[PDB]
């Protein structure tokens, strides 16, 4: 017996709970109130040597006094007192001690020590510690709510359901709770002194009561276990949604490569976690919207949406937003628009979103049923939606007509596999009478165009991830140095790496003295290129003489570069013309190698346009990377009467950068080709730069 | 007392309303309920030849039998019969006939005839027509609701306030009515057969019961009149907020110059409308949020925001969002930091947003009061916000807690001039107990961070419009050529403009035969040219040579250009290096000249980076335009060792383009320089394009 068995109770039905420090203050009162109103069937014990009884319930003098097996202890005494609570809870083999209060490892040195002593006393029996400094947790299916916050809400009650949430915030849970989400479990993680996000996530992965997971992430502590927890989730086919706080936080660290400034730590992490299936959103509203749509067991087979409205204006605005969010509302198929213009010749030209109100003499009922019957079967439409404002408090007349397409959606639900969604353009709360109808038929309901669009976008991304089947590999970071400094590699070594990886370098050689430079240059032709050496950025200090015709200009350009006390110089051909890109990889401290590719050259950081990819990179993927940058791609096709460049050579070079990255990331943490010149034939590595540490 | 005086009743108290075609159906019933429930104090008359009474209220057989002065008629009978109603209503000098039924000017040509027949019979007495084909209108301050739609909402009434709305979309009004806006008047424009948007807007401009205006725009019809109404609103210091549909719609109209593609009609219109004070937003939620904040009589003096929260995670998400929306949250002043350090040193270093929860042993009530009292007086902070989720149904303890900063805001409201706002991070419904505290104190309340940020940004924009007090002139499009076919100007006339406008081309001369060219070329020296004339877009068809180093290479090039049968050939000196910009103007069929400026060259449309300005352009305006394009601006300063370019000449160029546009817009509808080369000294137009007719 040990910590592993005890962990399991967090996702299960507890038979008994003891509340230590039970008194007349909010934590106790709300604990008892929650267990009452949420219909806990187990036994509650109160422990406090200061009181005879509370609410008529006996207050025990000690956990040791209780004649029963205790599953879960919630400790409410002060931090100093809590050490002995842990010790007594351990003595009786409590499976879990929940410590909602703060003033621990997250409050300073003294409190870190208290926290350590607690862990040490729990280690004895393997009792788990939840928190400290958190709201606790709740389990709607077990009716067990060791949770410090008011759960009972006559007005807007919590609804039980398939969505579970792990949150590193002790302040956003009521926000999730106040949403329309059907909740199963919510874990507030706190200091994660013992039970961490990956632990809760492992539980959720295999919890039959959860089909959808939401994470609210402030900071991942144990990257490897987290990644493995994510993998357990996809293994179990449970979508995982995340909000990650600190998205725009600089990260001030090292970097010799332009790649450093072009790929933020955040975007690197995002790319890796998406590789493992994470569906990122930006805020709670969006998390909710995505989860509400994913809570229905329907997925799209094609990345397109139909919207049926009763407003021209709103249809117009939705269409504009669809472009902003990159959601495809395509024309209806030729069968569909014939099927409709055949029974409703009075609608005319069909747009998507499609306004179907006041366009016919027929009952709106009939117009609606016709359109949705056809649109539902349309092979070019992945998701079927109705976009209609049906605000709370609307009149009966307004209900009669807004409920009509809901009823239709409900009537077609049993005979389609397509995701259905009724959403309102506006954010305001839905009329419950319309929601009742879609809730009864298992149709998703979302408030707000932007959220519905994010939701749809997220469905698609989820579908793609299921299709990949071959997800992102976990890279070991064990060999990686912990030093926080960077050492620039000698240009020689740089060149050696280009070679060994098959990258083509311009004909070049390193000269020691001026005559040698003239002698070498006069043995290759002009123009050549003269570059100072030992620098990360040569151009800035005038260490790059280009287009130097004749040995006359050569000796002069060398004359102007003497102040840069340059050890050896390098001369190369003047690689004529070719589109400038940047191709590199960096070593992420937690995740491993990542490849960076995009608009390159001296102005690379000003273009600020790249794409990332975790190796290995498939040939298909490299091609998609190229085509995903307009100015890059349109240039390869040959822009405005210009020769088409060597796509296939560029593609291969990207793949190759991927394999080198996999090979050398633990030792070389920066490897960059700026610019990698793309030409009619071949691609040329004009420059190279590598860093270590 | 024709048209003019009758129109004013739309904004005032009506004593009598006659409903023609009254029956037991929804339109009559909802009208009567609306007037009952909004407390209409005037007299209602029912008119219908079929009924002797309706629910025992006398039903007159004819308008003509009512022995009272009738102010407003609502016609509910079918279009055909409506002509007879119009004749009757005009005969008794009714001020307004409201037609919300459909089947008129928008239905068919038949409907069109009925409509003009109705206008015909109204002109007899100057009777105004609302609609047809709309829901009517509502004026909360006169308790008058000739409105076809349920306004009665016993549990969440429409609240009377200072915001008024003109919408070209019926189906949208109830979206607004369901919002938290304090409403004055709402006008639904319908077919705008007689009374149009600008008409409603003029009423609102001088309506003392309106202090904030929202427009939901589908298509401006009378541009001059619209602009003038805008200017009346401006004169009366009433902010105008607008949603304008069609933001993403194509318009491949006009256009020989790249400007056509860089500055689409929608962006052009937007710039002009903003010049007249319009505050654009993207959707209904945003319009609501902006109007809520403007409904309080406080404007900021510096363009910054402070936010106080009880969540570190939501603080963090708010910060991230503030970056996306471009809203400044600066550190607090030295005075604020010092002061709070002196009182709550345990808080440590203050960040903004400031999480004030669980940082102190002090009562939250004391912490909150100290922090807000200090932050309200902080000269570096323009807008004071509390950002706290307080959703409906939250517990008694959660209310007690989330209401604390609301009461503090309420208490400090009296002695600050700064805008105050309490917003939730999430979109969902506020706890009405918290909202009430803010409502009673005249403090803005918004739901959702995005809305909050858009509102703050709009406040800054409005305050800036107020400061310039030197607005966009109205340009006449009177003598503006009314053709639709765009004719390219010959390169001949192009270069003439350059000179007349003071632009300076490269050394250049026109030539006809190769010899004439090889001569001239040798006369000015190489490298040079070569460019075909009378063509596109020459470079697309290989009509531009470049870098021709000898008489040999010239003839080579001149021979490749053979097959494009050019009548003329332009020879110019090869203008060395320097930054490529595009500088132009275009004539907008409705608004007049606009200047386009940005990243130029062959890749101009791919860059898609320009800024627009309506002339006259001040020298300082031109500066901003330049510094607003990072790539351009950084190079002007001198990027990475490269020398600084001539800002003054660039700046002066843009001023000049604005002047040329003012002079020549009614004849030359496109004048474009691509590229305008920015050099170390001076600027040089390498190319020219123009169009007329
Ligand atoms: N062999 C070459 N042929 C033609 N052009 C070259 C050649 N080498 C360098 N250049 C040009 O000089 C520019 C800068 O060269 P290089 O990258 O070596 O210097 P740098 O200061 O180290 O640049 P960075 O650090 O921005 O990558 C290149 O972007 C390219 O335009
Ligand atoms: N006199 C010159 N000196 C140096 N470069 C030049 C000169 N004239 C043109 N160019 C180069 O050739 C490019 C195209 O020339 P130009 O604008 O005259 O033809 P174009 O096809 O009409 O271009 P566009 O349609 O984009 O305006 C310019 O953007 C510039 O880079």
Author numbering:
A (entry chain B), B (entry chain A): 35 to 727
From the paper:
D2 possesses a novel DMSP lyase termed DddX for DMSP catabolism. DddX is an ATP-dependent DMSP lyase which catalyzes a two-step reaction: the ligation of DMSP and CoA, and the cleavage of DMSP-CoA to produce DMS and acryloyl-CoA. Diverse DMSP lyases in some algae, bacteria, and fungi cleave DMSP to yield gaseous dimethyl sulfide (DMS), an infochemical with important roles in atmospheric chemistry.
To elucidate the structural basis of DddX catalysis, we solved the crystal structure of DddX in complex with ATP by the single-wavelength anomalous dispersion method using a selenomethionine derivative (Se-derivative). Although there are four DddX monomers arranged as a tetramer in an asymmetric unit, gel filtration analysis indicated that DddX maintains a dimer in solution. The overall structure of DddX is similar to that of NDP-forming acetyl-CoA synthetase ACD1, with a root mean square deviation (RMSD) between these two structures of 4.6 Å over 581 Cα atoms. Sequence alignment indicated that His292 of DddX is likely the conserved histidine residue to be phosphorylated, and Gly280-Tyr300 is likely the ‘swinging loop’. In the crystal structure of DddX, His292 from loop Gly280-Tyr300 directly forms a hydrogen bond with the γ-phosphate of ATP, suggesting a potential for phosphorylation, which is further supported by mutational analysis. Mutation of His292 to alanine abolished the activity of DddX, indicating the key role of His292 during catalysis. Firstly, His292 is phosphorylated by ATP, forming phosphohistidine, which will be brought to the CoA-binding domain through the conformational change of the swinging loop Gly280-Tyr300.
